[PDB]
Amino acid sequence: KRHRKVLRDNIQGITKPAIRRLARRGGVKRISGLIYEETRGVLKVFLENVIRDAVTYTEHAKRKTVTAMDVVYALKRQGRTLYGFGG
Amino acid sequence: KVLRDNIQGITKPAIRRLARRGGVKRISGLIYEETRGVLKVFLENVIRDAVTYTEHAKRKTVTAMDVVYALKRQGRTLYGFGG
Amino acid sequence: KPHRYRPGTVALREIRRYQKSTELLIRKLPFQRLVREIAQDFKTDLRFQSSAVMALQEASEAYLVGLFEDTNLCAIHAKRVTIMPKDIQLARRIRGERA
Amino acid sequence: MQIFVKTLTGKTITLEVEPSDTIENVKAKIQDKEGIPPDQQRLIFAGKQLEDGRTLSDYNIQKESTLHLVLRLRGC
Amino acid sequence: PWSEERVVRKVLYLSLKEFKNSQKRQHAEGIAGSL
Amino acid sequence: RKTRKESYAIYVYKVLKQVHPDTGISSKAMSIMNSFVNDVFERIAGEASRLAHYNKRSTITSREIQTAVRLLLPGELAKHAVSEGTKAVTKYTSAK
Amino acid sequence: KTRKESYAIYVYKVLKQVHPDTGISSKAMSIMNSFVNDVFERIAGEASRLAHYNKRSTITSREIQTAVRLLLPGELAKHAVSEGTKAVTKYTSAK
Amino acid sequence: AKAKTRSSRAGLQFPVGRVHRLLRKGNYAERVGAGAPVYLAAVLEYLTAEILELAGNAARDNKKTRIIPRHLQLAVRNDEELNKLLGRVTIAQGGVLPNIQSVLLPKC
Amino acid sequence: AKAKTRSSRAGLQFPVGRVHRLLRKGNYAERVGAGAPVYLAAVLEYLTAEILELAGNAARDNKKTRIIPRHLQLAVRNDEELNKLLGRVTIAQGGVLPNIQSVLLPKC
């Protein structure tokens, strides 16, 4: 036993009260109950898109470790620049 | 009847036409104003930079290629007119 | 006898509370697990800096927040006070995201 | 220059105002002479709802003009 | 030729709150130079 | 009659007949294809430009272009085109 | 080892010239670093094209001037251009 | 000794020499490799070929012999991947895909 | 001998030497004028001065000694002419502007 404990169904790691918190910060008052799966998928799509190119870069630089710069570049390419992590 | 600040040149039936090609069915009575202002705004935001390019090039006439560039600026590319 | 507040009034306090603080809103370890989960499929056997994950989070949250706000405006347009998936799916298309 | 502000309740009031006075200032004067809060008022003339940021000279209003004020509540 | 009466009937019917700009930021046009 | 200009029209036309050997093409569409090629060429080039400077190399290589594609073309087209280019090189290597 | 560059010191100096008595946290330094690192490129890249069109080969002030006139919205442009004009015509007088 | 084009040695249709020169005079780097311009021209060729036939079909469907913008527009807005690629381009004289919301249709 | 900083000869604080190095090594053009790095550095300095100044008042109004991100956020988002320039940037540890819609309030 070394590694590769492939986990499944971590998307359920996003508790409902968590999402409640976000929505509150957004400024919404009353909330339906179906959303708790809408966001669970939306967020996943969003993640996938980034992580792909994130990997792609490192791969090109041929390491096995995903630095932060990588993520910064990715988030920039898609027109979502992010300050505060060593641009 | 000649006194016409060109913004009025946008005749209501014209607006109706575009509205159609969009795919709208009914139309309130007011939009014929909103459009007249919105178009205006959009226009300056481009004619300005077009002018700017011409200026920096010391020229005195607005080449198409300028307008093209200015359009690529806002994020609205445009194929066909050269470039 | 026991005091119970008007319905929906707790929230009006929740908002004014949260719209002030700045820290995160999701506990890390599950989030990190989720990321490591998705990462396998592209090139398994990976390895991350810490701050990288922090970043990923930072962006995710800022995204979702901005999304909810516009969802709200949509919901008002139809004279409701709740929200519904049909609302999200509207903005997520007008933006051009799921276009 | 004097203006006439006709209200929905059949009252038409006179103000002290200059063409350079803004509609926010005119509404402030409405407050000071009637107690009607400026956030609740909407003045109408020349087929348009008066904008607070602009002055009377900007709307090209002449003397002896008769303006219309509606009580529009925002908030609450 | 101006439908003031029609727009006032619309003001009576619609009658909803509206949102707009609040503050004047001329200081960004001003003290910025003295900055 | 001087100051020659340039285009891709010739090549557009050539590769056309290789597909629909009976079809014509207007002028406007010709210009459009021209512009389009110009656009894409620049996009891919500018991308690889940064890709180097990040790793602080100094020369653009094929390997550069390879990934740079994977960042622009969505999904399928990428997998096809990379196959294509990979092939087209291999031949040129042996076939000087 | 392996020195890195930054803009920290200059930021701090400028800070002292307005609120001469106010600290600055660490992260809020890294931010203001990245910010400059951004605007720099966002101008220089544009100027590069702007030259390349008219088929020059050198970058001068004049284009930087124009290039600014494009990015910065409105009154900020009005000020910054005056600033540049001034703070150069002095320097050229006294090398 | 006798010469021959590069593209020949590549078995292609796009002018290598022009691509290479273009790379140089564009500042895109300091030094340009060798294989790259080949690889790049290849991709360009592939893409052009793709779009072309996609237009040619639709153009034939409406009984014509020479392609017209109105065709290209129809050609791109109907393959999502191509559509995605040009998500924001505006082709001149391009019209619009025909489409109508259901609700506006009559009851039956 | 007794050299002098180009910044001095300009009377500024930004490392004009450093800048002028960067332009040459950025493949931005073929050859760099002399006056440019000056003009550029001046613009940069002016900008960063403006923003810092605003943030300072921002944090003092909260009665604190130092400057932290939350200030910077609350600083930018309140000045539109800036705000446009930063339409697409995201400041970590940034929170949002305090805001609530008008409808969701109680009747009075």
Q: Beta-carbon neighbour count of residue D35 at 10 Å?
A: 7
User: What dihedral angle (degrees, nearest 10) is formed by the CA atoms of E8, E14, E19, E20?
Assistant: -30
Going by C-alpha positions, the residue among F30, H58, F12, F8 that lies closest to residue B80 is F30
Strand partners for D4: D14, D66
- The Cα–Cα gap between G43 and F89 comes to 37
Question: Do I29 and G58 make contact, defined as CB atoms within 8 angstroms?
Answer: yes
Give the structural domain span for C41. 2-99
Name the phi and psi angles at C76, rounded to 5.
Answer: -65, -40
Give the structural domain span for D56. 2-71
DSSP I77: T
Q: Residue G93 to residues A36, D68, G89, H13, I10: CA-CA distances in angstroms?
A: 67, 63, 6, 58, 10
- The CB-based long-range contact list for B21-28 (8 Å cut-off, 24+ gap) reads B21/H96, B23/H99, B23/H100, B23/H101, B23/H104, B25/H104
* Residue at D76 is within a domain: no
Partners of residue A53 in chain F, C-beta under 8 Å: 71
- The Cα–Cα gap between I7 and I15 comes to 7
* Helices within F1-96 (DSSP H only): 9-17, 27-55, 62-70, 76-94
Q: CATH number, domain at G93?
A: 1.10.20.10
Give the structural domain span for G79. 1-95
Q: In what order do the strands lie in the sheet containing D12-16?
A: D12-16, D2-7, D66-71, D41-45, D48-49
Provide the number of structural domains found in chain D.
1
User: Burial level of H26, CB count in 10 A (0-12/13-18/19+)?
Assistant: middle
Contact of F95 with H72, CB cutoff 8 Å: no
Contact of D74 with E18, CB cutoff 8 Å: yes
Contact of C67 with A39, CB cutoff 8 Å: no
DSSP per-residue codes, I20-42 = HHHHHHTTS-SEE-SHHHHHHHH
Going by C-alpha positions, the residue among B68, D21, A72 that lies closest to residue C52 is A72
SS3 content of chain D, % helix, strand, coil (to 5): 25, 35, 40
Partners of residue E11 in chain D, C-beta under 8 Å: 42, 44, 49, 70, 72
Amino acid at A35: I
Q: CATH number, domain at D32?
A: 3.10.20.90
Asked if the C-beta of F61 comes within 8 angstroms of chain A's C-beta atoms, the answer is: no
- The CB-based long-range contact list for A14-19 (8 Å cut-off, 24+ gap) reads A14/A39, A14/A40, A14/A43, A14/C26, A14/C30, A14/C34, A18/C25, A18/C26, A18/C27
Name the phi and psi angles at H53, rounded to 5.
Answer: -60, -40
Name residue, tokens 């919301």. Answer: H101
Q: Using alpha carbons only, how large is chain H's radius of gyration in Å?
A: 20
Q: Which residues 1-35 of E are in CB contact (within 8 Å) with G?
A: 28-29, 32-33, 35
DSSP G83: H
Q: What angle do CA A16, A18, A20 make, to 5 degrees?
A: 75
Name the pairing type of β-strands D2-7 and D66-71: parallel
Q: Residue C77 to residues C82, C93, G19, H102: CA-CA distances in angstroms?
A: 11, 16, 45, 21
This entry's atomic model was obtained through cryo-EM
- Please name the residues in contact with D73: beta carbons below 8 A apart, sequence gap of 6 or more: D40, E17
- Please name the residues in contact with F49: beta carbons below 8 A apart, sequence gap of 6 or more: F60, H28, H29, I27
Which helix (H) or strand (E) covers residue A75, if one does?
helix A68-77
- The Cα–Cα gap between C56 and H87 comes to 26
- Please name the residues in contact with C3: beta carbons below 8 A apart, sequence gap of 6 or more: none
Going by C-alpha positions, the residue among G17, G22, G58 that lies closest to residue I11 is G17
Q: Residue I23 to residues A62, F56, G17, G45, I64: CA-CA distances in angstroms?
A: 29, 16, 28, 10, 39
Provide the number of structural domains found in chain F.
1
Q: CATH number, domain at C60?
A: 1.10.20.10
Tokens found for residue C41: 């499929």
Question: Do E4 and D46 make contact, defined as CB atoms within 8 angstroms?
Answer: yes
Asked if the C-beta of A71 comes within 8 angstroms of chain F's C-beta atoms, the answer is: no
DSSP D13: E
Chain C nearest-CA distance from I13, in A, is 32
Contact of E3 with D47, CB cutoff 8 Å: yes
Domain borders along chain A are 1-87
Name residue, tokens 């009747």. Answer: I107
Chain E nearest-CA distance from I34, in A, is 26
